[PDB]
């Protein structure tokens, strides 16, 4: 229904969104694999098989796993996030995602991703083992200095399509550069009638 947002109360929305997030976040198991290359590909630059290919095949697979659950700009933003934060096979590291951007924010889209092994890896995976908590942007986050401004793109004061999630990286570990504490926004999709996880993220 159209006014589904209008009819609901703030807590009902917050809860609806959070539940949607969980649904996704838990629509797969910790550590499931999304890009695998044969062992053979580790050697040389031959076979490659090159960033735009890896980035692509990766994104393709992702789209197939997730579907409606995330907004299209989500994939969009992630692919943009490469470009200068490339996917490659490294002689020691094997297959990995290299942080090469002075822009910290370009790295932010990589938050949910990791490598099976720290040396000579062949696989790329997802993690759902982080603590997450609903956040009150409209009243708390938006004014909160240091990150009150990471979300410039939403009105907040007049817009009901968007809500914010907070994630805690303090007592967990990754094989690639890590951030600590990030926020991700959910958008209610009018056409679809459900919440989606956008590619809009930030906050160090």
TrEMBL record:
<keyword id="KW-1133">Transmembrane helix</keyword>
<keyword id="KW-0812">Transmembrane</keyword>
<protein>
    <recommendedName>
        <fullName>Sigma</fullName>
    </recommendedName>
</protein>
<keyword id="KW-0472">Membrane</keyword>
<keyword id="KW-0614">Plasmid</keyword>
